Design a protein around this ligand. Structure first.
Ligand SMILES: Nc1ncnc2c1ncn2[C@@H]1O[C@H](COP(=O)(O)OP(=O)(O)O)[C@@H](O)[C@H]1O
Ligand SMILES: Nc1ncnc2c1ncn2[C@@H]1O[C@H](COP(=O)(O)OP(=O)(O)O)[C@@H](O)[C@H]1O
Ligand SMILES: Nc1ncnc2c1ncn2[C@@H]1O[C@H](COP(=O)(O)OP(=O)(O)O)[C@@H](O)[C@H]1O
Ligand SMILES: [Mg+2]
Ligand SMILES: [Mg+2]
Ligand SMILES: [Mg+2]
Lengths: 481, 451, 48, 469, 114, 119
């Protein structure tokens, strides 16, 4: 037993508890829980995981004799829970006997296997240019209203792999709208929603990622694949900053503690691809960071960038200009790369990145029409049309076989005859035609995981026939020349 | 009973007998050598209670008796609150009482709103349409046009609405409060409006809690009576500002840009209470100050997360003379999707943004070279973009003293059709001055002839 | 022929302008970080 | 009660004893020097010294007055130069006044106010027309050094020939003397009180200087009389408070300022207001000043005061040097009261004047980068309007003269005349109307409106004069 | 105008006006140059540059630095000089003629040598 | 160092990434309670780096050749971390994607890459 000496701002100093463990769960006499962080000479600094309005000087605190642990299982699928693992949705209790500690060591060097299994987001821009494999960590970074959450939601919808959407410092109405989006798509059944909203104390925000990771690890070790989403670590960092400053830990760069990098490091590393000896399960990570005025150079962004296995930088200028998703091709990278791509995509989108790198270099010259030679003109016309293919509407994940065909169309130069503005509609109507009539081509790509010479010649004829049928929206129509 | 030990500005330390220590956020009264209301903050130890004063601490002495009420600051609630003026403490300034501190609604109770609130303004309805039972935010710099816009939104929407309203003057001008009082009196809308005031004159203790008092009143109108309530907060930043002021004096180590470490937490507790529930809904029109015209600043940066629609006022647009000076690119709305507002509206909205974005990109090139070096297509886009910028400007009903001419309200159908014709380029012949400060399409053509 | 010369110099001047601004940006970037931290640490040392 | 000093230095003193001392109570050291008890600690009393502390030591005896800071007030202060405490420095006898007021007083409440609908004429065409100032309004005068901030305030005071209160904070003595000399020449000193807390004085004086000047003005305000107060400037008063807070070991924030640096300016400016008819109906207009660095409006202290005041008059260096004097940036500068603080005559003619000139400056930039007819006319009009807004130093114009000058430009009577000859055209025109057509001026003075008769009269007078010119 | 008379004040401000406009065009001149500026601006820039170089003067203390002896210019000479420059009486003279000179006689003397 | 000294042979040392040592140095420095220096780095940045880099050196017996990777925050070479490192270093090898895309292996940029001993 111990007695509280000081209390305020969700912090409490406790007398007694002489043999208390570090990061041990404590229980205040109103039923509110706490965490012993700082074990001082003649006090114990504790952070409160709840309301502290009826926590006072003289109140009695007891030991549990346990380090932070949270229940886990299949019961959490299609449920909305807090960090501690209590359901907020109001759809009964969580029946699960199995439990896991929040703080657990990540897989060692020997207890891993190289990532060579694609995790399809269903987004043309990502899958083609910056592919994500099972066990990989791909950062989604950019300003507010750039479409960071949208990408993660679309990824979760495309898995229709267990999903774990962790919400940190989010407003309740947003988490509700995300849940509603999953219900409409029908992706909630295999999706766990951990929620630590803005109203909750700093402790919940600090814990929210670790709880979501622990839930995912249960599947990982059993030899099953998982996808976790942190939305977002920027607010979780801010939450930890608050705690540290209240405990009177010395601040550093941007008023953050020394172990703000270490905070994100332990979290993200636990996401990995296990060896064949340990089942061969995975746990993919999609952390989010909110930049301010597209400042990649900032402290917290740079920390997470250096941890993760590639980044998908979203821009405001591109988003407003019409490029949605607004992924900057030059800056965004995938560290795994071709290993996390099927052979079909690897071949078609091998020199897509090169063509678009040349396009951006040339782009300046495009305004000055017919002042250039032939070679450069063709590249600009090609590049402009490729951009339109990379554009994708919200909440519309495409299958891998549909993507490869769409990219194959543009790269080979089947859209050169068609106007640039009519490329989007051409793509939509083409896929509908192939889905209906030429399903064998899609089926072939699904099974073989490559585009055959037969399929190439088939597609060419299908395109040519469709071009004749296709009524061009703007001005007169054009098939071939 | 207690005894005052230490006083340092609006912070006061009080001794109490071992075991009879007041609870946190409890109101303590103390006689001035008037009655000063202190609210408990921290427990220092050795039966010492650090408290935040809700009025000036001038005239206090060490050893003065301090009585414990045994509860948090209470404020009046019900139909009696309507057509009255109150302070943070909940006392009538025009000559049941529940606590201001309370937990927010559960996740089960929260409803997602997907209903259009037709303002009448072209810029808002098109590019950033507001939501019924949503959270709307007027982001703006120093002396740009926040209060003029919030007064407009009151003037336009509130009269037509049969629901009651609650205004919260958090750390703003007492002069503007007097102007508002007379404005509401002439319109005869005082009867269906409750007013709470904790102006910049008062210490930071008031500005902290004044928002809670007004919110608590609104919550009861929502919950019990079952009313669609309006909540007008001006300005929400001043709460966060007050939060920083008390935080420093309490002896908390400051965070980024010298703000309180519990900035997101303090804001979180307030903002989350402001929600529309399945039973009954509340539409919150907040004003937000942006220090140094810096949206990256923690204060405005954190607020953005809570809001469903946002209206970002920029000085660049204000300097041109475009009123209201809403930044069309930066400003955003959650409901702007083909599902809610239909494919046509979404198509026109995005197409307008595309044109304005390209115009902004060419500003750097136009600054040096000019229009001559741009292509035939770009030349036309720039011409249209400039005309679109000036058409977004509109006469405000509240701004009769400013402009001179009376305000104009433009329906949704008129708005959509107008920007449709502009994008297609049907009004390429008309001059730039024709688009400046006009509502309907008829007024454009009428002014075109005069010029 | 004259344009070639005129625009060549303009491009060379633009290159120089970029380098001067980029240095000025980094000067400010480093300074702002240094300045903010000194104020934060200054407040921390004030108490204890 | 009696106390003893334990620590002393840097204009700060810790005192033992004084057990039942009030907060912000006036203390008296044994040399006759005063002090203010700010921090009442457990076993000490932190006091700031309002004077020289050279003969204040450890062991010296301090006594209670039993009073919160107060300063004498009355008609005696008119045409006198005083310090914050209210002691005359000019050397023209003592201040005979029994009436006193506390420095720290609560500003008028929401109910104890009336909407500002009474013009306070600065006599400056740029201000009165575009950014008008009403009785009870707070109009910030902000800009770099040598932009003409003080000049505007002096010209405003001269035009009142309404009680004036020129508060000088952190100013050099020779400047305050030159300001006093300027008032004597114009003959505006008789109704002007000069509060002075120069650079030599301690931080306490600079901190107090605005509150003392406000307290003096409030005496007239509550009696139902109109006042104008000028803070020159709050930038230095902020710096003074920063010094005090840092010495008392209060934790610093943004730009090394304390948390309540905004709160400092807030309580000061708010006390400036327009009272209700029930409380007489007196006023107290404020003209605070802020000194920006490299036209940095984004800075902490500027942004604080901008958010408090009822509009701002941003002065620019580039405009001042280019010949636009006063150098008021039209686009950035605003009046929150607006038309309400303008007579009907000015409201009609200068209704959309600020908007037209905001468009002009935008087009002026875009013009540099073959135009049509409409835009060309706007540029030619705008260019001529700028020349009218230009005004020489220490030359306030009457309201009736301004309305005619603006009416001339706005209606497009100067379009035929070259731009360089606009200034001389204005001067000679006013001389003609002053001499011959005084009835037109007299009409505007009385009615505060331009009649349809007066409009047609002016048109004929202009046309006749143009021929002669 | 009270202390230093109307003429001095007029010339002083007129010089500042020219130098201010020159400084504003620095950004445009840095990229494009003088060619893209208008006929009026071209002349203003030419005068501004010549005014900048005329403001330079030989210092009596700086004999070891420069080499040439210093020069003292009375008020009347100063006012008259900048009067002629603003009007554009010395538009024909080169830029090097204005560099590091005191009186108007020394301008014309150095002009012939170049 | 032991492979260098005792065995008597030229040993290779591959460090990835050397910046992260300096980064770690800043993290510990703050928590220890040292007041931060320019751009929120540790006050003993040059000292910590100096002690490490100077050990990596050629003796009479034999040498150690260090092939290091260096992160440059914000693409800013003026940043104290990369600014201090450059003082210790002899040579640079800049691999470019343009040369890699051609199929030129190794894809060393011949212009950008440099060496101090080229005299
Ligand atoms: N690919 C897309 N196409 C069209 N609209 C999109 C796309 N992605 C996102 N959006 C819209 O833009 C908004 C982006 O906001 P949000 O997802 O909150 O960005 P962030 O999470 O980065 O703040 C969303 O509300 C969504 O409706
Ligand atoms: N309207 C004006 N026309 C011409 N000169 C002016 C005008 N206003 C001010 N000045 C001159 O400019 C200088 C700066 O004025 P001042 O008010 O002292 O600026 P600041 O208050 O910024 O120092 C003074 O020498 C004054 O004579
Ligand atoms: N829509 C508008 N039309 C005309 N003038 C405006 C408009 N909005 C703002 N202004 C001008 O700018 C001032 C700023 O208003 P206010 O909202 O009180 O400032 P703040 O943004 O600091 O609250 C107004 O009082 C008015 O003079
Ligand atoms: Mg999001
Ligand atoms: Mg306001
Ligand atoms: Mg001055």
């Amino acid at each position: 037993i111990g007695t509280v000496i000081d209390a305020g701002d969700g912090i409490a100093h406790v007398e007694g508890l002489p043999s208390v463990m570090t990061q041990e769960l404590l229980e205040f006499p109103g039923g509110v829980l706490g965490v012993a962080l700082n074990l001082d000479e003649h006090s114990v600094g504790a952070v409160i995981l709840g309301e502290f309005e009826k926590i006072e000087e003289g109140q009695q605190v007891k030991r549990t004799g346990e380090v932070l642990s949270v229940p886990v299982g299949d019961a959490f699928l299609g449920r909305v829970v807090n960090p501690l693992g209590q359901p907020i949705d109001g759809q009964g209790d969580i029946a699960a006997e199995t439990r896991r500690a929040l703080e657990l060591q990540a897989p060692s060097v020997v207890q891993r296997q190289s990532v060579s299994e694609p995790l399809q987001t269903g987004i043309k821009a990502i899958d083609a240019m910056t592919p994500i494999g099972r066990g990989q960590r791909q950062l989604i970074i950019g300003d507010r209203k750039t479409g960071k959450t949208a990408v993660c939601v679309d990824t979760i919808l495309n898995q229709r792999v267990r999903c774990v959407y962790v919400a940190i410092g989010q407003k309740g109405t947003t988490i509700a709208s995300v849940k509603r989006a999953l219900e409409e798509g029908g992706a909630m059944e295999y999706t766990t929603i951990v929620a630590a909203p803005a109203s909750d104390a700093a402790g919940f925000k600090w814990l929210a990622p670790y709880t979501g990771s622990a839930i995912g690890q249960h599947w990982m070790y059993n030899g099953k694949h998982v996808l976790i989403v942190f939305d977002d670590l920027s607010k979780q960092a801010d939450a930890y900053r608050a705690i540290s400053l209240l405990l009177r830990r010395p601040p550093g760069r941007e008023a953050f503690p020394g172990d703000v990098f270490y905070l994100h490091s332990r979290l993200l590393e636990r996401c990995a691809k296990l060896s064949d000896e340990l089942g061969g399960g995975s746990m993919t990570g999609l952390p989010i960071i909110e930049t301010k005025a597209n400042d990649i150079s900032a402290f917290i962004p740079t920390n997470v960038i250096s941890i993760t296995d590639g980044q998908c930088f979203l821009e405001s200028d591109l988003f407003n200009q019409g490029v949605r998703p607004a992924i900057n091709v030059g800056v965004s990278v995938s560290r795994v790369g071709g290993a996390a791509q099927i052979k079909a995509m690897k071949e078609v989108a091998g020199s897509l990145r090169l063509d678009l790198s040349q396009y951006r270099e040339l782009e300046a010259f495009a305004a000055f029409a017919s002042d250039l030679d032939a070679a450069s003109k063709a590249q600009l016309d090609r590049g402009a049309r490729l951009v339109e293919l990379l554009k994708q509407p919200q909440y519309s994940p495409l299958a891998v076989e549909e993507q490869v065909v769409a990219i194959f169309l543009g790269t080979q130069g089947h859209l050169d005859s068609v106007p640039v503005e009519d490329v989007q509609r051409f793509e939509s109507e083409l896929l509908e035609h192939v889905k209906a009539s030429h399903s064998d081509i899609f089926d072939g790509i699904r099974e073989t995981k490559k585009l055959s010479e037969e399929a190439e010649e088939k597609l060419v004829s299908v395109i040519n026939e469709f071009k004749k049928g296709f009524x061009x929206x703007x001005x007169x129509x054009x098939x071939x020349x | 009973a207690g005894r005052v030990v230490r006083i340092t500005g609006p912070v006061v330390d009080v001794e109490f007998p071992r075991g009879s220590v007041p609870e946190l956020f409890n109101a303590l009264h103390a006689e001035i050598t008037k009655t000063l209301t202190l609210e408990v903050a921290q427990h220092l130890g050795d039966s010492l209670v650090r408290c935040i004063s809700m009025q000036p601490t001038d005239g206090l002495v060490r050893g003065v008796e301090v009585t414990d009420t045994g509860a948090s600051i209470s404020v009046p609630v019900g139909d009696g609150v309507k057509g009255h003026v109150f302070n943070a403490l909940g006392d009538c300034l025009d000559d049941e009482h529940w606590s201001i501190h309370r937990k927010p609604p559960a996740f089960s109770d929260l409803e997602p709103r997907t209903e259009m609130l037709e303002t009448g303004l072209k810029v808002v309805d098109l590019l950033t349409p507001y939501v019924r039972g949503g959270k709307i935010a007027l982001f703006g710099g120093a002396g740009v046009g926040k209060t003029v816009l919030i007064q407009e939104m009151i003037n336009r929407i509130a009269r037509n609405f049969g629901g009651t309203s609650v205004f919260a003057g958090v750390g703003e001008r007492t002069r503007e409060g007097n102007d508002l009082w007379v404005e509401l009196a002439d319109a005869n809308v005082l009867k269906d409006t409750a007013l709470v005031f904790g102006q910049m004159d008062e210490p930071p203790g008031t500005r902290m809690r004044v928002a809670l008092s007004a919110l608590t009143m609104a919550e009861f109108f929502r919950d019990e009576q079952g009313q669609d309530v309006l909540l007008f907060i001006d300005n929400i930043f001043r709460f966060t500002q007050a939060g920083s002021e008390v935080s420093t004096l309490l002896g908390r180590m400051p965070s980024a840009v010298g703000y309180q470490p519990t900035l997101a937490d303090e804001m979180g507790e307030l903002q989350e209470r402001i929600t529309s529930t399945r039973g009954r809904s509340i539409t919150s029109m907040q004003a937000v100050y942006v220090p140094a015209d810096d949206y990256t600043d923690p204060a405005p940066a954190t607020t953005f997360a809570h809001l469903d629609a946002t209206t970002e006022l920029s000085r660049a647009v204000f300097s041109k003379g475009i009123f209201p000076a809403v930044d069309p690119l930066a400003s955003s709305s959650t409901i702007l999707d083909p599902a809610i507002v239909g494919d046509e509206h979404y198509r026109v909205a995005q197409e307008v943004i595309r044109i304005l974005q390209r115009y902004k990109d060419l500003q750097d090139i136009i600054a040096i070279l000019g229009i001559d070096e741009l292509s035939e297509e770009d030349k036309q886009l720039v011409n249209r973009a400039r005309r679109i910028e000036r058409f977004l400007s509109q006469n405000m009903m509240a701004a009769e003293q400013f402009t001179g001419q009376p305000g104009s309200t433009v329906p949704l159908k008129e708005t959509i059709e107008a920007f449709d014709k502009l994008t297609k380029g049907e009004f390429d012949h008309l001059p730039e001055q024709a688009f400046f400060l006009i509502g309907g399409l008829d007024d454009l053509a009428k002014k075109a002839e005069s010029l | 022929a004259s344009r070639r010369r005129a625009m060549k110099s303009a491009t060379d001047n633009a290159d120089d302008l970029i380098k001067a601004l980029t240095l000025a940006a980094n000067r400010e970037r480093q300074a702002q970080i240094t300045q903010e931290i000194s104020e934060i640490v200054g407040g921390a040392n004030a108490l204890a």
